[PDB]
């Protein structure tokens, strides 16, 4: 497919402050969103129907992530905790305590027995899902940790930071295996592994996305043209149809690039504030996007490819 043809299907209203993160459940049925309003909301992925509000954090939430079972959710909050939730009941099952400042980012491993978190306290923590105990505290960075993500089998973690670094960690040992550096050292605002685990996609606050072979320390692709100088905006690989890179942007648009050619293939217009977060549906050509305070909505878009 030359280009996708994403078109607006639903606008989901409900959050009372800026939205921070949206994530589709692994089985595709649900979208979860988090907000500065201290709430998590669950929505139907296909009809955009509000399902429920999940509450309990004492301050704003910066990120949410789903277990492989599509029922457990973890949230990362400014109240210095993460919470694990049973989405079917909406109950908090446990509170993960240990970070000394805002928890900014979180993720389950594929096995879904561990959670990784990054914090303004400059550490990465690895948590036991069953006991709620902190297993390891990694002295990962020298400034706030903007993203943390497990690779395809959970053996590795990638972390990014305002300190300008991306680091690859061995999960089992907590050892740093690789540090990626840029001579001009821009803050790294987001990172994640490619679906195949071989690459990392890293956002820096100089309006640039970069695809790296981290083992070789080699940058393979750069995606530009969007606006990203201020916020930690999520980016994604879209793999259900055409192979795309998808990101939010500080000009209120969703950008979509051809992964190989690096060309912008679509820009999705409709939000009225910074698109802080986007997510790609696991099986369908569906994107969820979410925006800041002037907007406060989540949009669902659908493409033929």
């Amino acid at each position: 497919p030359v280009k996708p043809n994403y078109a607006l299907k639903f606008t989901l209203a409900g959050h009372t402050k800026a939205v921070s993160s949206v994530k589709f459940s692994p089985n595709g049925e649900w979208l979860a969103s988090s907000s500065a309003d201290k709430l998590i909301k669950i929505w139907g992925a296909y009809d955009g129907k509000f399902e429920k509000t999940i509450s309990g954090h004492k301050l704003g939430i910066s990120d949410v992530a789903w277990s492989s079972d599509s029922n457990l959710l973890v949230s990362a909050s400014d109240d210095k905790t993460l919470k694990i939730w049973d989405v079917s009941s909406g109950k908090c099952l446990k509170t993960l305590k240990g970070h000394s400042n805002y928890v900014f980012c979180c993720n389950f491993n594929p096995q879904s027995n561990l959670i990784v978190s990054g914090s303004f306290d400059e550490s990465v923590r690895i948590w036991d899902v069953k006991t709620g105990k902190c297993l390891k505290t990694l002295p990962a960075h020298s400034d706030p940790v903007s993203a943390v993500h497990f690779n395809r089998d959970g053996s590795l973690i990638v972390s990014s930071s305002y300190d300008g670094l991306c680091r690859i960690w061995d999960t089992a040992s907590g050892q740093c295996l690789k540090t990626l550096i840029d001579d001009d050292n821009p803050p790294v605002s987001f990172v994640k592994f490619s679906p195949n685990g071989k690459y990392i996609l890293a956002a820096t606050l100089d309006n640039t996305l970069k695809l790296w072979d981290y083992s070789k320390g080699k940058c393979l692709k750069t995606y530009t043209g969007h606006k990203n100088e201020k916020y930690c905006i999520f980016a994604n690989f879209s793999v259900t149809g055409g192979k795309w890179i998808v990101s939010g942007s500080e000009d209120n648009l969703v950008y979509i690039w051809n992964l190989q050619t690096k060309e912008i293939v679509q820009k999705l217009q409709g939000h009225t504030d910074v698109v802080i977060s986007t997510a790609c549906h696991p099986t369908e050509n569906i994107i969820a996007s979410a925006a800041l305070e002037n907007d406060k909505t989540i949009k669902l878009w659908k493409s033929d490819c």
């Binding site: 402050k17 800026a18 939205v19 921070s20 993160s21 907000s35 500065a36 704003g60 910066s62 990120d63 400014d78 805002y102 900014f104 303004f120 706030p144 305002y162 803050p187 605002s189 606050l205 100088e229 201020k230 916020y231 930690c232 802080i276 800041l292 305070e293």
Partner: peptide, 9 residues
Amino acid sequence: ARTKQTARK
């Protein structure tokens, strides 16, 4: 925090 700007240039 994510909804606020917290980074150096």
